[PDB]
Amino acid sequence: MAGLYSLRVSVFSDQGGRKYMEDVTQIVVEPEETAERSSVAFFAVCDGHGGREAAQFAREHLWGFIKKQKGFTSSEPAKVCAAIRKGFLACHLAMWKKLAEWPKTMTGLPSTSGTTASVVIIRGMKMYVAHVGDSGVVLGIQDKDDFVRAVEVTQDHKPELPKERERIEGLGGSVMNKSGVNRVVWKRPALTHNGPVAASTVIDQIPFLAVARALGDLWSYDFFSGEFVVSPEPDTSVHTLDPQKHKYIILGSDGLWNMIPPQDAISMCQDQEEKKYLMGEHGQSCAKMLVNRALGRWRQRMLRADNTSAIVICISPEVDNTNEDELYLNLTDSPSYNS
Ligand SMILES: [Mg+2]
Ligand SMILES: [Mg+2]
């Protein structure tokens, strides 16, 4: 069952109209002694907020925390998903220890930085997907066909999602519509012995987050229960890749998905793939095309563009290799990339 297929990967991110770039992306391909030096491929999009520090920390450390966990190289998927979940948690817990080193807010309080994190890990014919937040992951599947259908395989962790609101209200928080957007409302401040700032002023400085799960956001720690109101535990899923039917995996931040719906995005990739081999080295990758398309829609709607990021993975049943901004991967050939 050790199947042969190829991937072609592109990635692009743009700051949009924001003053800082807090989106990050990551791609790591490395041989696994487990799969007899067949390579595992890790892809991630992290949409940071409250400062770039958390997203940058996940960029540098999330994959290492994941692949260290017991059961990660197990052949049983339930154990792989369990290891991936533990790696998210370990990365979150490592940020807590880093918090003193991250820059203070403009009022002198500890950093409020946090980040969504969406991860795709391909090993063999299996695709593991883990996420916290709203940087969605979309598959394209061809059922032959000249139409590729989008499938959304992650659900955004919005505060008003019922499972999330239940968890938040159970810790003593609330979910409130603030200016048309539902937000987590937490009023329990992080109090110290040596800190100067007034407690009532700490309370007013607590963020109102638009996601209910993230890595970081350590202000959400609940001293009473020991839980974090903004949860670092990801949803996990496993899918069997069928190179005859699966054609695309898109990971993206909400800068992309707020402008470009899943089917629009998958149908655009299907159109760009034709063009990409007519412009050759100098056409836009699918990822670059998606980001620029979203930026065009932000502008056309007269809105400041968010940070916008995408990773597009094209799946091919062939294993025979011209776009300079695309990485070709055959995982049974032990490629190494950024590793
Ligand atoms: Mg952001
Ligand atoms: Mg965003």
Side-chain angles (χ1 to χ4, degrees):
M1 299 187 132
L4 305 171
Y5 65 94
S6 59
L7 309 172
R8 308 166 290 311
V9 185
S10 56
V11 52
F12 194 82
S13 63
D14 181 279
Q15 193 174 312
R18 311 281 306 262
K19 171 53 206 101
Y20 310 93
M21 180 56 158
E22 293 174 336
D23 272 14
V24 304
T25 60
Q26 180 68 287
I27 296 166
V28 174
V29 180
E30 66 181 65
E32 280 191 327
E33 326 303 318
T34 304
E36 199 217 27
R37 304 221 76 216
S38 172
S39 284
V40 63
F42 166 86
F43 310 86
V45 169
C46 301
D47 179 350
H49 49 255
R52 193 209 182 81
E53 301 65 20
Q56 191 58 45
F57 187 92
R59 200 194 128 80
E60 156 145 47
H61 298 117
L62 187 54
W63 173 231
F65 279 121
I66 286 171
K67 56 206 245 210
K68 280 189 170 202
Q69 304 305 323
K70 317 222 190 233
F72 178 62
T73 62
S74 157
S75 48
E76 163 169 13
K79 290 221 220 159
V80 181
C81 290
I84 292 167
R85 166 199 170 267
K86 282 174 177 93
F88 272 62
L89 289 195
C91 189
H92 176 77
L93 297 170
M95 295 180 189
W96 212 356
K97 203 190 82 223
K98 283 288 325 272
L99 177 62
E101 310 206 319
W102 289 352
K104 296 344 191 143
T105 71
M106 37 159 308
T107 70
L109 289 171
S111 169
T112 60
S113 186
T115 184
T116 70
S118 295
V119 162
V120 166
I121 288 157
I122 297 176
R123 179 198 278 149
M125 320 292 297
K126 303 265 158 310
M127 191 203 36
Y128 295 84
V129 184
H131 86 283
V132 289
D134 62 357
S135 301
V137 180
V138 170
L139 256 52
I141 304 174
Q142 208 186 30
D143 299 317
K144 198 70 208 173
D145 254 0
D146 216 330
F147 184 74
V148 179
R149 161 170 79 72
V151 184
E152 199 193 318
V153 296
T154 60
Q155 173 174 47
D156 294 344
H157 294 131
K158 294 307 195 199
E160 70 274 18
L161 206 51
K163 174 129 75 83
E164 305 304 305
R165 168 197 303 275
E166 179 149 77
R167 191 180 44 70
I168 294 165
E169 302 184 337
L171 298 171
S174 46
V175 176
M176 279 178 183
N177 189 296
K178 307 334 226 173
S179 323
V181 192
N182 300 291
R183 287 175 179 281
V184 180
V185 183
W186 183 237
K187 301 285 199 189
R188 304 214 183 140
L191 295 189
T192 88
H193 289 84
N194 296 107
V197 186
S200 75
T201 325
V202 181
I203 304 207
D204 311 0
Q205 294 317 155
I206 305 177
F208 292 137
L209 221 57
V211 288
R213 302 209 203 162
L215 299 187
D217 286 298
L218 307 148
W219 51 265
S220 84
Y221 178 68
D222 171 36
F223 293 82
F224 189 89
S225 69
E227 310 262 277
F228 288 90
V229 172
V230 177
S231 170
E233 175 190 317
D235 281 344
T236 57
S237 56
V238 199
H239 313 263
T240 296
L241 275 204
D242 169 6
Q244 299 293 320
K245 302 253 162 255
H246 295 106
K247 301 286 133 222
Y248 305 108
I249 308 154
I250 307 174
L251 297 84
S253 68
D254 66 352
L256 173 72
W257 303 124
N258 283 338
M259 280 312 88
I260 300 191
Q263 192 58 69
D264 272 17
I266 285 296
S267 289
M268 297 181 178
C269 288
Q270 175 168 16
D271 300 318
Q272 187 67 4
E273 232 194 314
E274 148 152 46
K275 301 156 202 322
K276 228 183 305 191
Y277 62 68
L278 305 185
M279 308 181 81
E281 295 177 350
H282 309 319
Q284 275 174 358
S285 62
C286 289
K288 182 163 181 184
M289 172 268 310
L290 283 179
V291 170
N292 278 332
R293 290 283 168 73
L295 297 174
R297 287 172 180 213
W298 282 110
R299 177 180 268 148
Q300 198 150 120
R301 305 240 308 242
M302 302 308 331
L303 294 168
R304 189 210 272 260
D306 187 13
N307 299 166
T308 303
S309 300
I311 296 178
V312 180
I313 300 156
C314 300
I315 302 159
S316 174
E318 328 278 311
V319 280
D320 201 338
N321 203 5
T322 61
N323 194 283
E324 100 195 330
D325 287 343
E326 252 180 346
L327 168 66
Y328 178 88
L329 300 174
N330 181 349
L331 292 186
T332 48
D333 277 4
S334 314
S336 269
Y337 178 82
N338 183 24
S339 182

